[PDB]
From a paper:
Structural superposition of [name] in complex with [name] 114–122 and [name] 114–120 revealed nearly identical conformations, except around Tyr191. Here, Tyr191 rotates approximately 9° away from its position in the [name] 114-122-bound structure, leading to S7 site closure. Compared with the [name]-[name] 114–122 complex, water molecules 6–9 are absent near Phe133 in the truncated complex, whereas a new water molecule (water 10) appears near Tyr191, forming a hydrogen bond with the backbone carbonyl of [name] Lys259. Additionally, the interaction of the truncated [name] 114-120 peptide with [name] was weakened by 7.6-fold, indicating that Ser121 in [name] is crucial for its [name] binding.
Author numbering:
A (entry chain C): 114 to 120
B (entry chain A): 31 to 334
């Protein structure tokens, strides 16, 4: 994933 | 007066969530970055896929163009930024020094510097030519969600989960202003207006605000969208009517009248959180992109 796409 | 954005293209090809889309300053291209560790380049006007750029070893949270549209910089969970030659696809530089995920990045207008923000709570300023880190700013007390230069590069604005927006003097690295809210909601996005006099700031309480940052006065608020969880890009649209554009966690693109604060359009069609929107530099074109249940980019066009 990527940090921006994770809550 | 309201825009009439209509869907023109859906751009499929990323295999995980899209994280950020940006148009090239010369208007030719859209770049997209993704949790799938890839950058993709697409034609801004016909949506045609151009190329894939790869080399990050973990996912990418942001991408940004140099002012001459020749370079890109990307921010990755692998704790690095990479500078890319768009024409060749080659990684020209790897920017090392953050100690946690790099979340956001931008070139200055001169495009001799890059600014980055990270989960390590710092803002770093990098020399594009050498790749050296010139300054590390102890900017915030929680992850930095956005970084942006103003029109002449003399200021940086940063935002954070710590609830603050800060304005920094690029040359010295000193903090010139802190914008504070008593409820301290996380600030999930910030950027300067095209003229540099205002900042647009998103907070994770479903709210966007337009600030005159020197006076420390909130001039406008925009509501109606859903934003409690993700760092969603928002934009000034100035090629036609003067709008504010944002993604939303209800899978819609929201467009407001900047001055009246009314919602003037909602763009339907994505099937997951619209994490990123971008406005074309010269045409009334919006790019939008969504998270893992969707993974597509959509291009929309309006007559105003």
């Amino acid at each position: 994933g990527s940090a921006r796409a994770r809550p | 007066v309201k825009p009439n954005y209509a869907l023109k293209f859906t751009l499929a090809g990323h295999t995980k969530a899209v994280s950020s889309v940006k148009f090239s300053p010369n208007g030719e291209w859209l770049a997209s970055s993704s949790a799938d560790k890839l950058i993709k380049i697409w034609g801004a006007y016909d949506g045609k896929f151009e190329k894939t750029i790869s080399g990050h070893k973990l996912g990418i949270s942001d991408v940004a163009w140099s002012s001459d549209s020749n370079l890109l910089v990307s921010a990755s969970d692998d704790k690095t930024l990479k500078i890319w030659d768009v024409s060749s696809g080659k990684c020209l530089k790897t920017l090392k020094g953050h100690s946690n995920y790099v979340f956001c990045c931008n070139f200055n207008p001169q495009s001799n510097l890059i600014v980055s923000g990270s989960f390590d709570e710092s803002v770093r300023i990098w020399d594009v030519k050498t790749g050296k880190c010139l300054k590390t700013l102890p900017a915030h007390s929680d992850p930095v969600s956005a970084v942006h230069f103003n029109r002449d590069g003399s200021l940086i604005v940063s935002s954070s989960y710590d609830g603050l927006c800060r304005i920094w003097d690029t040359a010295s690295g000193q903090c010139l202003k802190t914008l504070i809210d008593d409820d301290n909601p996380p600030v999930s996005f910030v950027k300067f207006s095209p003229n540099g006099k205002y900042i647009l700031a998103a907070t994770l309480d479903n709210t966007l605000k337009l600030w005159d940052y020197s006076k420390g006065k909130c001039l406008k608020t925009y509501t109606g969208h859903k934003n409690e969880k993700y760092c969603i890009f928002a934009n000034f649209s100035v090629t036609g009517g003067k709008w504010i554009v944002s993604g939303s966690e209800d899978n819609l693109v929201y467009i407001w009248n900047l001055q009246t604060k009314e919602i003037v359009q909602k763009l339907q069609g994505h099937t997951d959180v619209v994490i990123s929107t971008a406005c074309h530099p010269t045409e009334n074109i919006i790019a939008s992109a969504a998270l893992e249940n969707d993974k597509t980019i959509k291009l929309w066009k309006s007559d105003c």
